[PDB]
Symmetry: D2
Subunit: 25 residues, 4 copies
């Protein structure tokens, strides 16, 4: 049950970060 959560979170973070930067820079 976790591993998946962990992963999904990772991916989610990469994506959010990517967005943020895509705005800023």
């Amino acid at each position: 049950y976790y591993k998946e959560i962990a992963h999904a979170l990772f991916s989610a973070l990469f994506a959010l970060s990517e967005l943020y930067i895509a705005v800023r820079y």
Copy 2:
């Protein structure tokens, strides 16, 4: 700036949804 933020918007949407789903299902 724009095409980018669309791509990243999508990315974060799919990823966050995957996370949500993986946490509750």
Copy 3:
């Protein structure tokens, strides 16, 4: 069993495409 496959595939495709372009353009 499928839905997940489907999703993962989608994401995979977005990523591959993103790569390809990141090379080409």
Copy 4:
């Protein structure tokens, strides 16, 4: 060109792994 292709490389790697995992597990 480069930082980008690193980001996209990562993205495709994590995503493809998620797909693989979801198909066999």
